[PDB]
Amino acid sequence: SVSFRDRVLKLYLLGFDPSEIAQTLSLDVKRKVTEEEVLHVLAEARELLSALPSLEDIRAEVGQALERARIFQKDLLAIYQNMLRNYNAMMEGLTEHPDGTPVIGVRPADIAAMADRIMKIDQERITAL
Amino acid sequence: MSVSFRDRVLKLYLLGFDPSEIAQTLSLDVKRKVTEEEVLHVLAEARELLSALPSLEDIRAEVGQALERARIFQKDLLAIYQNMLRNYNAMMEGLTEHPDGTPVIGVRPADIAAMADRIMKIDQERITAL
Amino acid sequence: RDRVLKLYLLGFDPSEIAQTLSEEEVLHVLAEARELLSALPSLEDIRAEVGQALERARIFQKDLLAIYQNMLRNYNAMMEGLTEHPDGTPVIGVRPADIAAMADRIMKIDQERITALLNSLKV
């Protein structure tokens, strides 16, 4: 299989030796496998890993890193609004919101901490471009 | 096929879902048998668009947003700073509640100095960026 | 109009922005706002931002100096053995390290000011 070869490559990188990789795959698949069958799959995959990246592939990986950072920034921005909404409710002396959900106590430093980590994603994106 | 389909395939890959799991979830949304090589081809198209270099005004576009977002955060923290300083002055003079009626929360000097520094850090980061 | 740009930066997508105001109309305003933010700032715009920032720093520095004097007034009252001040306010506990920490943060505002004025003269 294709996923069988990936499972072998994963276990090798995760620290298992060919002997341990053969035992674990003998529980997954019915038919047992020898070390030469494992080592040849390694020999194929290891030469593919050693393929040096083109200059365009690094720029591709930079563009993906920025896009992944935008996704985290959107998740963190939604959390920042919840923290700030909770902070205003804490000062007003409310136990529940107008929505109905419970007010959770948030410290000023935690809001400013969350602000900095959202702003640092911008700075790193500017530095990357 | 769609505009959101292009973005959703790339989103799930960047959140750690492999091509197999992307195919299964997108089959529920867009009611078809979505193939694994279809997901990989969309990934390949996405990597080509992302590998293109940014323009000089596209850098200015991102810089302008970062500084404007910093201004929005700075006003949120500036409001928090005034509350802390108002609380400190009330605590210093032995008050439990303010004139308006809201309760006096205890604040340490180091917290006020810390909050001030974070506000000034944003201004330094603005000036340096310009 | 400015409020649309605010909600975009705070993390709300175009669809959610239309719901609060009440999508295709919103996306165009953000595209126009992109070109405004994409414009290169003038030197006189930068001089204004440096002037405002350093004046805001002086306001904070004046607030922290007022707190430094309170910490110092408390320390001498604590050391002399007083529970209460002459004016009637209570004597709060202060650690020597906190006074030095407060002094350090006041002194760094001068250093941050000098460094900003140094970089401004070159650029």
Add this chain to the structure above:
Amino acid sequence: SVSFRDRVLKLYLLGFDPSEIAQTLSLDVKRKVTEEEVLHVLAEARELLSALPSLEDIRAEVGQALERARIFQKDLLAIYQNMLRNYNAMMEGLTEHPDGTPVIGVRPADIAAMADRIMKIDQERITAL
């Protein structure tokens, strides 16, 4: 007034917008004030803030920073003597001093910490000169 214009400039930098600045000054002063009256005071003060410093004014600000540091150093030096005086009394097994004041417990690291912060003010002054 002159202090009225400074109050407006302070509130603007502290984060208030012209609408909020007009409301707060309407409580301080009897007669209410419009936004154009506020914005024109901003327009005067903002152009004065944008005045670029002469090379002599930076040297002036350096000299003041060193003089402010000398004042803090004198306050910290007086505290260092109190810590050391207390440390010697702690070893001797005294609860009160010969003066009459109470002995307070001080750790060795706190004295050396206070020493370093006094010495760092010198180093920074030497670096500044």
Add this chain to the structure above:
Amino acid sequence: RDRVLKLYLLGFDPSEIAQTLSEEEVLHVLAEARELLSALPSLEDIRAEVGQALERARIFQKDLLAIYQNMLRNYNAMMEGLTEHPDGTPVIGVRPADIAAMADRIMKIDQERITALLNSLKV
């Protein structure tokens, strides 16, 4: 034979290595092993080590992304007020700072990858 080199690096002296296997025979094998390790590595050997390391990084990155989604799924359940998830698993407490910390460590794996691929192209 490789096991002798392992025990030497783990801190056991030649005398103790002979006791586990069962000294002069051991010292010679280490001297021969020294010359093998003293050999300069090829470029294709380095390309393999960079390929393995960055692939191992992707495996960790995929594991941490799976944990990030769990933390995020827990946070929304905690905020909405649920004790239990739909599938039957318990809702665990998550602090906002821990989610940002997890995001940061995932983002640094991209930065560490880009820096390693940048240094590889030059060398």
Add this chain to the structure above:
Amino acid sequence: MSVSFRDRVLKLYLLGFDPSEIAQTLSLDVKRKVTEEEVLHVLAEARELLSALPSLEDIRAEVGQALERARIFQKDLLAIYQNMLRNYNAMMEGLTEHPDGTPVIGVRPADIAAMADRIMKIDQERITAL
């Protein structure tokens, strides 16, 4: 007017008192109506003197004091180091009091290593400064 008046005006300004509050407090000391523009003029005179550049021997004057002050601190910490080491040796061998009669205080190895490092830091800062 006076020598201490010049210094006291500058001191209060550097401690965060504005020209108005400086005028009020100095009116009590020097028994006159001290004007705000008088305080501002003294501030202006002070800024001119401070803006003057330092001489090369004036740098050596400050450097010489900093190193001599470091020697005074080093002897204070060196005495503290011997007390900690004397305490450690007594604690190691199960003693409650010393031969002289003073009580044995508990000390950790890391504290002695920390105190030693701070003493050696002063020597590094001395050598580097020279």
Add this chain to the structure above:
Amino acid sequence: MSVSFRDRVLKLYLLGFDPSEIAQTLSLDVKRKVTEEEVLHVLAEARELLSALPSLEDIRAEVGQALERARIFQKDLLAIYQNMLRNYNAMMEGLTEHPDGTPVIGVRPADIAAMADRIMKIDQERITAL
């Protein structure tokens, strides 16, 4: 006199024993009156050998060991990582014991991210060294 005698004299000096204490302890091992100037002469011989500069392949000898030792540590930590991740998955789904029978220990997300980082640090240190 001996090979181990040369090494043992240098070892005791580097562990903080002075020439007097080295002479006393070595007199018990090698049953003679070991002189202080004999210890100092062995120290002098040792300093001459250590002062000699390293060869270019001697650097490669040490580098090769450091990377191989790093691989041995990395496999020890990689095994620990799998145990933590196996524990986390069991804790997530409300299990007290594993299928094999061993007990489920609680693990935090930050610990797994910390352990992963240390494993990746070794790979960075390997690549950089090469």
Add this chain to the structure above:
Amino acid sequence: RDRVLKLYLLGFDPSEIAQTLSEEEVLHVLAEARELLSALPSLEDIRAEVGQALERARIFQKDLLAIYQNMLRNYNAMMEGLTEHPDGTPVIGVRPADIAAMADRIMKIDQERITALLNSLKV
């Protein structure tokens, strides 16, 4: 005479120095002391300060090595299960991280010595 310079550096003003000894006489001695400290140091003066500092470092290094051996002797006694040593002294608890921390600080004294001797040869 040296005691006047000591009290000035410790933070006492000229007025307070006259009170302890028992102002215009004190200010002149400080002005004369300023010129002495203002004098540029010789190379032989610097060589003395480097020699004293590195010899003082060896004294500390010898003290920390003696403590390292005690920590190590305690660790082996703790691991073997002993409460008391052969000589009669008590076995104290030691954490592995503290032993490595102690080793690190001893090793940095060698590095600080080598760096100081390197900078001295140039200057």
Add this chain to the structure above:
Amino acid sequence: SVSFRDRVLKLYLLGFDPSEIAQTLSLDVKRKVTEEEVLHVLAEARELLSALPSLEDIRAEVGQALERARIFQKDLLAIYQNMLRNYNAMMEGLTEHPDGTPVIGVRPADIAAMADRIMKIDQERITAL
């Protein structure tokens, strides 16, 4: 004596002045000693300390620093094996080892911490060479 002169040089560097050095040696040795006897021993030793190192002596001191680091590395490596041996016993649910000694609880981070400090000694040795 020779050790008497070293005791004087030690006490001077440890912070004692000639007056205090004379008092302490008057308790150790029967016959009391004057300050000129102390100061002349200082005068001899201080000129010997000011002897500038040859380039070979620095290389000698580097070689000793590396050899001292190897000794610590061997002590730390033996501790690492004890931590790892304990960690495996903790997972297996053993209170005592097959040897007989008690199992002590060790955290994963402490093992990886100990690993890094052993590996950092190598890195610093490579950097030194």
